[PDB]
GROMACS .gro file of C-alpha atoms in nm:
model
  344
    1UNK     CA    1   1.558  -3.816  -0.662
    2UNK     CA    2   1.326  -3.696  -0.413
    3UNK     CA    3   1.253  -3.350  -0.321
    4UNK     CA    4   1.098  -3.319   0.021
    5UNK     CA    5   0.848  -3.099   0.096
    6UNK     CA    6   0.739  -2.997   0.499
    7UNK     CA    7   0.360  -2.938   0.552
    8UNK     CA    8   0.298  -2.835   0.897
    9UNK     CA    9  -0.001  -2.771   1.083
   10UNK     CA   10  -0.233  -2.875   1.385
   11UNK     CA   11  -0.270  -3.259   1.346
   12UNK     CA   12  -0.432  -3.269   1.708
   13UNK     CA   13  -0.548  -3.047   1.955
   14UNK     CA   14  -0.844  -2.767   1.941
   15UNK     CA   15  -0.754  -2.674   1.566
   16UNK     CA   16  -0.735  -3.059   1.430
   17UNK     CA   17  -1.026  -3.031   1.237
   18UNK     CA   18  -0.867  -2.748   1.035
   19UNK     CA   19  -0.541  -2.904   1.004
   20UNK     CA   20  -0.718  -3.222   0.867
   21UNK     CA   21  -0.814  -2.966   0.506
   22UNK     CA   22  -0.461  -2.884   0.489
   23UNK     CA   23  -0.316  -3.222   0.503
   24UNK     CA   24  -0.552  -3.373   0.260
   25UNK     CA   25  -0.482  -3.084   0.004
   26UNK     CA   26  -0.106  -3.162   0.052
   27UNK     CA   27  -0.160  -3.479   0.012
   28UNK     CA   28  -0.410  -3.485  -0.295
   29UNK     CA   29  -0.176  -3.218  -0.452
   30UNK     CA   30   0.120  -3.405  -0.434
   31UNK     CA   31  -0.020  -3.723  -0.537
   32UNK     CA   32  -0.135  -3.529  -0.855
   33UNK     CA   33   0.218  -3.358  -0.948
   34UNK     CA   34   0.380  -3.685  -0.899
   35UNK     CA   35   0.154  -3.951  -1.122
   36UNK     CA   36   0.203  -3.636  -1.405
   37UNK     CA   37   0.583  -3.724  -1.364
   38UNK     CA   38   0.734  -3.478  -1.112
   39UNK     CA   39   0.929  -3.192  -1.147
   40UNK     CA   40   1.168  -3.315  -1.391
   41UNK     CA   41   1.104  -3.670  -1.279
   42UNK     CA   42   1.180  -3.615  -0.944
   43UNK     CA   43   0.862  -3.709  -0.703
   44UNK     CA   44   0.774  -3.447  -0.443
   45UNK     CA   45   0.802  -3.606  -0.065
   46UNK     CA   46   0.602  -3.461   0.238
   47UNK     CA   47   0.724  -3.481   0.563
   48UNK     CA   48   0.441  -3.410   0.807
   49UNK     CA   49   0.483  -3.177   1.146
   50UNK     CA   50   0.205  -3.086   1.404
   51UNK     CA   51   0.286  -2.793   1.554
   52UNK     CA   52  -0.063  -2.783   1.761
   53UNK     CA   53  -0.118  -2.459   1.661
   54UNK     CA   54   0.068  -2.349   1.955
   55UNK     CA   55   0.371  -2.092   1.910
   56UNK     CA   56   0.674  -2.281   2.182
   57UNK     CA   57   0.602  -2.614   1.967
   58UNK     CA   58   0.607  -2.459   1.619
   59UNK     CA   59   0.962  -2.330   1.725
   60UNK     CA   60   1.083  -2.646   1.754
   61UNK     CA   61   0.902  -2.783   1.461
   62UNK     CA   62   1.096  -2.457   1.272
   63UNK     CA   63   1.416  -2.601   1.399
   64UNK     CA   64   1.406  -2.953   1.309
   65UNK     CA   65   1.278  -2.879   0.978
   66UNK     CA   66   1.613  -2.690   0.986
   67UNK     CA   67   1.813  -2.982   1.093
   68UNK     CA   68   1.643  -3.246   0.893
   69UNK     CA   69   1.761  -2.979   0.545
   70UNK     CA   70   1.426  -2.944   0.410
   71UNK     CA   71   1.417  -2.597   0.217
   72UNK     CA   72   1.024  -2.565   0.155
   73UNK     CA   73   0.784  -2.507   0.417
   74UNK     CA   74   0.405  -2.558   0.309
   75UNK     CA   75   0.257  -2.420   0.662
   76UNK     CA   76   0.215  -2.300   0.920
   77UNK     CA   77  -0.171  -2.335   1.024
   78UNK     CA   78  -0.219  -2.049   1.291
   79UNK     CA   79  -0.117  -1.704   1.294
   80UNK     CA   80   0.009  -1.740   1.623
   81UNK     CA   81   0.236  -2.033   1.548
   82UNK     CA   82   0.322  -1.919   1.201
   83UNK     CA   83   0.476  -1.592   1.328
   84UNK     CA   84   0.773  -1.673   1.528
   85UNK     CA   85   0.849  -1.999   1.286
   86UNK     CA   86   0.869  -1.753   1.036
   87UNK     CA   87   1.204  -1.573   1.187
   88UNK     CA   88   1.375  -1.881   1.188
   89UNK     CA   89   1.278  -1.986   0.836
   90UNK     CA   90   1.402  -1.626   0.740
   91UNK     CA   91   1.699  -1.634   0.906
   92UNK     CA   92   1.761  -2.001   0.771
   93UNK     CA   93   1.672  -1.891   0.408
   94UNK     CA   94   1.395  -2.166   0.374
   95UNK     CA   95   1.124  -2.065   0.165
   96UNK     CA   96   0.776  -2.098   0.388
   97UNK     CA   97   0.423  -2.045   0.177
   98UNK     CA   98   0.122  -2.035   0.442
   99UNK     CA   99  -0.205  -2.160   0.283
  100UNK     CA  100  -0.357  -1.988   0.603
  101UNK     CA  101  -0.206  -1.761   0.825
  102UNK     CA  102  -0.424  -1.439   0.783
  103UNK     CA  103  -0.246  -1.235   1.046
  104UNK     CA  104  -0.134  -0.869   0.847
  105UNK     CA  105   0.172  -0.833   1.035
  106UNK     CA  106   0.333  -1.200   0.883
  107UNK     CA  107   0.403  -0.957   0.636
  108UNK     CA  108   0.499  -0.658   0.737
  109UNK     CA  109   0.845  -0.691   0.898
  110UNK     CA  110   1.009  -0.700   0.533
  111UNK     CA  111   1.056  -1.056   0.516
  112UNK     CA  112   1.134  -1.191   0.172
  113UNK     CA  113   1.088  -1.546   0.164
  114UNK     CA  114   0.720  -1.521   0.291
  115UNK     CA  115   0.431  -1.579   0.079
  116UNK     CA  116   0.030  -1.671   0.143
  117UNK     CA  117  -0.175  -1.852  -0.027
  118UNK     CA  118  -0.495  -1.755   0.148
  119UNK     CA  119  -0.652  -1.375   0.090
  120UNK     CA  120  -0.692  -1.164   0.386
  121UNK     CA  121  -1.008  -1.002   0.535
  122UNK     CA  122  -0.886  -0.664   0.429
  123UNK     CA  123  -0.939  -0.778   0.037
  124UNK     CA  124  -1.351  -0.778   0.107
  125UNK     CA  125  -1.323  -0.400   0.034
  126UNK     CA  126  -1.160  -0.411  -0.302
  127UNK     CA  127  -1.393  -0.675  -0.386
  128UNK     CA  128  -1.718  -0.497  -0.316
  129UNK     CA  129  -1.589  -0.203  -0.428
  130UNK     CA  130  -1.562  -0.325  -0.770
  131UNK     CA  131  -1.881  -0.546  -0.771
  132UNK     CA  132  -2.040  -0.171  -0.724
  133UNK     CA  133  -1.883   0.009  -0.938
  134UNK     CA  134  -1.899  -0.315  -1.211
  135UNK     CA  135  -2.264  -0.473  -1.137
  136UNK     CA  136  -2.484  -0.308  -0.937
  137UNK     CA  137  -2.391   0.134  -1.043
  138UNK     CA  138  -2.602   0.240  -0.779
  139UNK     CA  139  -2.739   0.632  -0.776
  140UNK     CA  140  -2.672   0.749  -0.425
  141UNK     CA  141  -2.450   0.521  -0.194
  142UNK     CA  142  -2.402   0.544   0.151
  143UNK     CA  143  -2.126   0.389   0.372
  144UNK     CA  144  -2.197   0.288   0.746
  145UNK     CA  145  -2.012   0.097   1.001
  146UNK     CA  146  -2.022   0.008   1.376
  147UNK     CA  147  -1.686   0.182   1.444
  148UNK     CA  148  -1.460  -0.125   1.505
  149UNK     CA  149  -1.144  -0.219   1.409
  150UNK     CA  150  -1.316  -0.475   1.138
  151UNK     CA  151  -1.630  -0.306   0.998
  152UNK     CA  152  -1.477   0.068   1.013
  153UNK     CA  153  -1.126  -0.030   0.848
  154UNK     CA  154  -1.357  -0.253   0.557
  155UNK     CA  155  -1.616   0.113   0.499
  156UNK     CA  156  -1.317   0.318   0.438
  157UNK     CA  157  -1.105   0.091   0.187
  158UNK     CA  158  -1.537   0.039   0.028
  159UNK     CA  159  -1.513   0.474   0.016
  160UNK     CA  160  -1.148   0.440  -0.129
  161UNK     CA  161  -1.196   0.257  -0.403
  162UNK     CA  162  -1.565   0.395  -0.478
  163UNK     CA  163  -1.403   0.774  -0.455
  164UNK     CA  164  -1.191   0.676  -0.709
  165UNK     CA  165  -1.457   0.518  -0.936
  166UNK     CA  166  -1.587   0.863  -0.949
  167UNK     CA  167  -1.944   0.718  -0.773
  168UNK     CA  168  -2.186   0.923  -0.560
  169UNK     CA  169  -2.121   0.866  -0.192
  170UNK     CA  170  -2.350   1.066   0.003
  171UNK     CA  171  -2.238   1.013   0.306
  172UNK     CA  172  -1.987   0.783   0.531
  173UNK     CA  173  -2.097   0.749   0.915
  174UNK     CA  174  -2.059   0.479   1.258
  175UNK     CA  175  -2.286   0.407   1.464
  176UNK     CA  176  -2.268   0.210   1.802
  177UNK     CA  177  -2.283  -0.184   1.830
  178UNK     CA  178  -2.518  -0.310   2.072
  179UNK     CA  179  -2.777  -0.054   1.952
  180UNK     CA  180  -3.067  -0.177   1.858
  181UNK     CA  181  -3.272   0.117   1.726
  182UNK     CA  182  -3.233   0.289   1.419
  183UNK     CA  183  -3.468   0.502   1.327
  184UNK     CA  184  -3.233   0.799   1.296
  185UNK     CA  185  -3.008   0.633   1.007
  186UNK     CA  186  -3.356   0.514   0.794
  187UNK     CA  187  -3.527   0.845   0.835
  188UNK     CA  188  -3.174   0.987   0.694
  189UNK     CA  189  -3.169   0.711   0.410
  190UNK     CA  190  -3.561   0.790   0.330
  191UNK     CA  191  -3.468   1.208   0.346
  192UNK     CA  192  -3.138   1.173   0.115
  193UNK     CA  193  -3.280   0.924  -0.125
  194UNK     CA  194  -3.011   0.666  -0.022
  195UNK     CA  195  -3.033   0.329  -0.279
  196UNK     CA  196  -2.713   0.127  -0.172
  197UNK     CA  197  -2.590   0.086   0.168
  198UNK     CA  198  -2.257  -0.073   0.208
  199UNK     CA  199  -2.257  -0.174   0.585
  200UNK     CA  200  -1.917  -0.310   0.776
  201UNK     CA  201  -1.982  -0.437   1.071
  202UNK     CA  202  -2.160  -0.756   1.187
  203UNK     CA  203  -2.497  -0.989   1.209
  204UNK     CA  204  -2.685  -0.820   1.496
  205UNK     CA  205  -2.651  -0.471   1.386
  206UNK     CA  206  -2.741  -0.583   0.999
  207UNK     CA  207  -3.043  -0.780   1.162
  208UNK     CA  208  -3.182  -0.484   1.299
  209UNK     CA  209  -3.135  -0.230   1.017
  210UNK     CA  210  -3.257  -0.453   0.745
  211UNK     CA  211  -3.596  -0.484   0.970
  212UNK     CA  212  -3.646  -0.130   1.012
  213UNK     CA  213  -3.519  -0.072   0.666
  214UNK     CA  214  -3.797  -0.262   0.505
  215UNK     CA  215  -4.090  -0.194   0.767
  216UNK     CA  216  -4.042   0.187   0.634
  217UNK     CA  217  -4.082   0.104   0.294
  218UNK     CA  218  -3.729   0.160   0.164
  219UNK     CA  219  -3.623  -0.062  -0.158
  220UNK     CA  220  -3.255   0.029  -0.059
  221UNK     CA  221  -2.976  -0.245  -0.175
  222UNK     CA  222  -2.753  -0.335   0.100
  223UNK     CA  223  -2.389  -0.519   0.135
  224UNK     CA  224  -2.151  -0.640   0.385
  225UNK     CA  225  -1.885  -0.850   0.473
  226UNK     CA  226  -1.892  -1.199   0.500
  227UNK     CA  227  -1.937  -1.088   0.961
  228UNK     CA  228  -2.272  -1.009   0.832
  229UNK     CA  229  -2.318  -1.327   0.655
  230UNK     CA  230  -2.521  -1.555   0.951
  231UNK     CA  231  -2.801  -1.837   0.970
  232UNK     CA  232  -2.971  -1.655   1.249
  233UNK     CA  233  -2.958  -1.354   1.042
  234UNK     CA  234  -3.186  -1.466   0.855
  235UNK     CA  235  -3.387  -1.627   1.128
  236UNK     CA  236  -3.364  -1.235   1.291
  237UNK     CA  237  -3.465  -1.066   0.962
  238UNK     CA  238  -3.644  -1.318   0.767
  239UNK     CA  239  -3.793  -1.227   0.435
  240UNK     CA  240  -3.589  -0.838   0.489
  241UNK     CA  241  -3.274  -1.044   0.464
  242UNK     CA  242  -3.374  -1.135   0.075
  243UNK     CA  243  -3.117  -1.015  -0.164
  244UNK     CA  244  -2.857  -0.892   0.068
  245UNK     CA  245  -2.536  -0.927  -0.115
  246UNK     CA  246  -2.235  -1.051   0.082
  247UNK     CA  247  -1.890  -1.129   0.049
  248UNK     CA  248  -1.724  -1.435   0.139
  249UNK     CA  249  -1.511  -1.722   0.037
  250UNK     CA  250  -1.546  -1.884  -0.305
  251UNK     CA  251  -1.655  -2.242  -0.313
  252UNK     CA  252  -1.366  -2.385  -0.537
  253UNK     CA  253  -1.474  -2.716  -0.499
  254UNK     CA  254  -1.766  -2.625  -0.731
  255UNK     CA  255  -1.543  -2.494  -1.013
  256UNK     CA  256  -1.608  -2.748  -1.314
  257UNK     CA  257  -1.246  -2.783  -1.351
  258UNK     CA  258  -1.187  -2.907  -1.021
  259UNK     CA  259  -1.426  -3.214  -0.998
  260UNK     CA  260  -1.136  -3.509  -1.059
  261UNK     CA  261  -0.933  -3.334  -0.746
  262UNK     CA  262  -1.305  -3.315  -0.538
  263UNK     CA  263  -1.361  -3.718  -0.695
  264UNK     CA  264  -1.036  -3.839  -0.627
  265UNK     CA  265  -1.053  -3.691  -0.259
  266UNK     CA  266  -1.463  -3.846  -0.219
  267UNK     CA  267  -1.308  -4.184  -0.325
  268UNK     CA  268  -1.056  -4.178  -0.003
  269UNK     CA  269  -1.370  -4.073   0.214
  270UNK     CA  270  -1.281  -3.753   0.235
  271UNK     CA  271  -1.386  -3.386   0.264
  272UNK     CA  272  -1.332  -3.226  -0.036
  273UNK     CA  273  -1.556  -2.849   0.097
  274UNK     CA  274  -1.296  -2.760   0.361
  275UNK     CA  275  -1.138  -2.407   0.245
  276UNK     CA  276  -0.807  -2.503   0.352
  277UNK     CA  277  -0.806  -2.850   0.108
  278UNK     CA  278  -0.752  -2.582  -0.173
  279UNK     CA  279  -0.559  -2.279  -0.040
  280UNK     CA  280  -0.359  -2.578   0.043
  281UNK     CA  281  -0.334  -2.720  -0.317
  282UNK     CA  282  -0.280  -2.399  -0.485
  283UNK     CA  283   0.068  -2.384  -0.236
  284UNK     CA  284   0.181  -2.663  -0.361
  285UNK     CA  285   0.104  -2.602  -0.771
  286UNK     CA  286   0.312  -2.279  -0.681
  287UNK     CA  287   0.598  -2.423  -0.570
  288UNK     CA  288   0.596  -2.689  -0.827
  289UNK     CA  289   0.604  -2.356  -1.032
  290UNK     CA  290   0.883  -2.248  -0.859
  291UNK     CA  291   1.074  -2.562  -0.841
  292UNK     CA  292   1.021  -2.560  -1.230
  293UNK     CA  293   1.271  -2.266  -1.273
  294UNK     CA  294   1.547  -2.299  -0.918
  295UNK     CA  295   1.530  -2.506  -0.647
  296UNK     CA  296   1.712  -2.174  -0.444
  297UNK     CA  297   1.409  -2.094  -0.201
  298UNK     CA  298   1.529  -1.714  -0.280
  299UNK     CA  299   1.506  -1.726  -0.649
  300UNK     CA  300   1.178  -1.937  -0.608
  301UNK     CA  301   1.033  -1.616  -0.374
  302UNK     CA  302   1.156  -1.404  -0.649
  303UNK     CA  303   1.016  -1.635  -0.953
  304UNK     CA  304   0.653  -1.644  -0.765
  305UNK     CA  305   0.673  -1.232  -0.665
  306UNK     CA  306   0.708  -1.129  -1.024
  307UNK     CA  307   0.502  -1.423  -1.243
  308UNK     CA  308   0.142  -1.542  -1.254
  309UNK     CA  309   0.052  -1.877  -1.180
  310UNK     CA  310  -0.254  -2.098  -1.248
  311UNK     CA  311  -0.418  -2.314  -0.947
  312UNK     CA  312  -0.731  -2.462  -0.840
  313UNK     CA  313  -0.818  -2.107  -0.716
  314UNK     CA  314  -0.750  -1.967  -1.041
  315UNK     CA  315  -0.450  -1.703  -1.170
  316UNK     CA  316  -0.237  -1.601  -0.832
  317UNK     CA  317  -0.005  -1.313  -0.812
  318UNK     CA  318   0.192  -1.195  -0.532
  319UNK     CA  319   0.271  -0.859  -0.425
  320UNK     CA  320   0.613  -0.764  -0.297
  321UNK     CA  321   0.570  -0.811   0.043
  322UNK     CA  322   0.429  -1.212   0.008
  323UNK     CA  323   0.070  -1.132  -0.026
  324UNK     CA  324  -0.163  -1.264  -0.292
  325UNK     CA  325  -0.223  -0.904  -0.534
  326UNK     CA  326  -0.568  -0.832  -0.663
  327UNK     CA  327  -0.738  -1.161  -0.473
  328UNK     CA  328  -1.121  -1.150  -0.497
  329UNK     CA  329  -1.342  -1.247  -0.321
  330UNK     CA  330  -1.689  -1.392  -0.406
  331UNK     CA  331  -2.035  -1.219  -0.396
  332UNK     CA  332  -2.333  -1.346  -0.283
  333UNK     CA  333  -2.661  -1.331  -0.263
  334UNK     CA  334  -2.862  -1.387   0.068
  335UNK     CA  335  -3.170  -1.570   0.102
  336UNK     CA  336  -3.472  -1.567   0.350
  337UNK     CA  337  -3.384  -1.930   0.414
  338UNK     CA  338  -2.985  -1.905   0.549
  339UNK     CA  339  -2.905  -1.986   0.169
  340UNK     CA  340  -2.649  -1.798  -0.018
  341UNK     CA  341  -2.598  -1.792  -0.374
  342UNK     CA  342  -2.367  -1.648  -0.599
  343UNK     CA  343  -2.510  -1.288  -0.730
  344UNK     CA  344  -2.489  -1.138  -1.099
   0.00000   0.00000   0.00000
């Protein structure tokens, strides 16, 4: 007896080309968890909705999924659109796992059958954090940003977690974007003996101090976010972009494990590298998790918030609020030629 399953996202408009990764790691997953047998031998059943990524029409996608009885919501695409379908499906008690949605404040209004499948931008710190304090044990560290709302909030969670690592932070500072000369901050990381920058912020700024960096003869390691991580950064910086770590997005379709989901997806002429093709997946494996143990979208939130479950993106955990717990991110290594590989 089917169980249907509603996977909504932008299936035209400006987004489409985004929507297309979700749909074919619905579709991929589902095809998967049925020719295994089920859930019990009942076949999961997607019903597609495009909500064009635009907030009035994913309110009345929200309310038909209502009236057609589905209980499980594998969507929305865009925060924007994903927000307000979210109070219905709360009010409604259908369970609704986003494999995209990146927007902190999904989240934060208490909500308790809400749940992501994608990590937020805010988990960059945590990752580098550890990478430091794991891999690279620098000697003296020093923490800039370019005083916005990305790069400043990203140094501070970086100081955070290295504070509590007990490592040597010499000293945490901003300076302005749009600047373009910094021979104040390398004089100061030649005078204090600084050997690892961490810098949040993005390309342009990172262009400039990596030149200036190198042309004075400092061997200082530097970091950023994946804002930093830019072809025409390295176009900018050239050879002083070398061995820049960044972090970013793993590339799941090049876990080993994966290759019969990226094979059977090449065979249908498909893209198999989108992102959202496996945040996408994973959604699904965790509600065939659920589904497993209740088929009450409340005691599935409850199941998923307080177990571990393996996907295509590896062990996921969710924190109280809906939001994947201790997601990492990966850590790369730039090259001179816009490559990027993945560091030690």
């Amino acid at each position: 007896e089917d169980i249907k399953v509603a996977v909504v996202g932008a299936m035209s408009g400006p987004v489409a080309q985004y929507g297309d990764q979700e749909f074919t790691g619905a579709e991929q997953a589902v095809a998967d968890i049925n020719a295994k047998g089920g859930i019990k031998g009942n076949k999961l059943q997607i019903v597609k909705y495009d909500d064009a990524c635009d907030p009035k029409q994913a309110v009345a996608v929200a309310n038909k999924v209502v009236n057609d009885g589905i209980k499980y919501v594998i969507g929305h695409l865009c925060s924007s659109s994903t927000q307000p379908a979210s109070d219905i499906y709360e009010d409604e008690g259908i369970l609704m796992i986003t494999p995209a949605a990146t927007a902190p404040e999904l989240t934060a209004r208490g909500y308790q059958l809400i749940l992501r499948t994608t990590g937020l931008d805010s988990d960059q710190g945590p990752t580098a954090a550890k990478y430091i304090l794991e891999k690279v044990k620098p000697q003296r560290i020093a923490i800039v940003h370019d005083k916005q709302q990305y790069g400043e909030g990203l140094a501070r969670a970086v100081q955070d977690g290295l504070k509590k690592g007990n490592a040597n932070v010499v000293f945490f500072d901003g300076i302005t974007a749009g600047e373009k000369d910094f021979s104040t901050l390398v004089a100061r990381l030649k005078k204090e003996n600084i050997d690892f920058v961490y810098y949040g912020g993005y390309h342009p700024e990172m262009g400039q101090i990596l030149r200036q960096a190198r042309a004075a003869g400092l061997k200082t390691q530097f970091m950023g976010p994946e804002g930093v991580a830019n072809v025409s950064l390295s176009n900018i910086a050239g050879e002083s972009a070398e061995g820049l770590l960044v972090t970013k997005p793993k590339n799941y379709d090049q876990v080993p494990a994966n290759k019969p989901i990226v094979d059977a997806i090449k065979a249908k002429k498909q893209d198999p590298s989108g992102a959202f093709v496996w945040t996408t997946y994973a959604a699904l494996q965790s509600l065939q998790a659920g589904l497993n143990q209740s088929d009450d979208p409340a005691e599935i939130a409850k199941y998923l918030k307080a177990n571990s479950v393996d996907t295509v993106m590896g062990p996921l955990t969710w924190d109280e609020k809906g939001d994947l717990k201790g997601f990492e991110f990966g850590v790369f290594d730039w090259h001179a030629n816009g490559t990027a590989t993945d560091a030690k």
